[PDB]
Amino acid sequence: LNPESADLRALAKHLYDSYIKSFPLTKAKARAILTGKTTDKSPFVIYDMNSLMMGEDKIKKEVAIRIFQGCQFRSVEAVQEITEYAKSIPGFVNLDLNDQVTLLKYGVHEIIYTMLASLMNKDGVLISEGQGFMTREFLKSLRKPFGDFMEPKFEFAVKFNALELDDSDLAIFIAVIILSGDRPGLLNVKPIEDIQDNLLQALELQLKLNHPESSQLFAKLLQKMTDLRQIVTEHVQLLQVIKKTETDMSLHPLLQEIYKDLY
């Protein structure tokens, strides 16, 4: 087709390459691990407290807290990977640095739950870069309110995963999320919306080309962008509850930066 199309194809490919470089465990590998369609060693399954201790070998006082703390190391690395990815989005590093911060601050969580779905099925979630598989029931079973953290992310994941997106689709979708002009406290919305308009066009063409039999995939996917915001708000409230009722725990400083005055 035309040279306008062609620029949008080139953007899609640029984002896809950069996605591949930024994120070690892609949805492609993750699904191979989960279906069994890779033929190398399976993940160690963690379904109860006993399996958790036994698995402490192959993944890196009270268990809920131990899982909480390990989840922080992973989040912090996710934020790092997402930041590197954002910096590859054409036009992003030319924005006001304060606006770059605001976009990441609000966007990283929504991207994290988007990409966590790649790691999930209805029964559990790959952890520790595909080496562990932690069951959904086990996570529900954890003592309140820790058993509340993951279940909404599973419910989201099961519906989101039905769209059958691949990495090349997700690369553009996540760039769309980051370049949201309606984040609180943005100084200069116009250059952000100019980039997002382009990304959205690129997303729409990608979905028509890559899923030509699947009409209104573009519209279904845009509606999930609001589901992601609900997950985030509910997640931050649970985090507030924990911060009050588990006085002893400490939150990693990167995560403090992000969650602050977003509570």
Binding site: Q80, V93, L97, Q100, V101, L104, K105, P253, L254, E257
Partner: peptide, 11 residues
């Protein structure tokens, strides 16, 4: 005031 994010972004 987002000192880590500032550092990650300028890196």
């Amino acid at each position: 005031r987002h000192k880590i994010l500032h550092r990650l972004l300028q890196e």
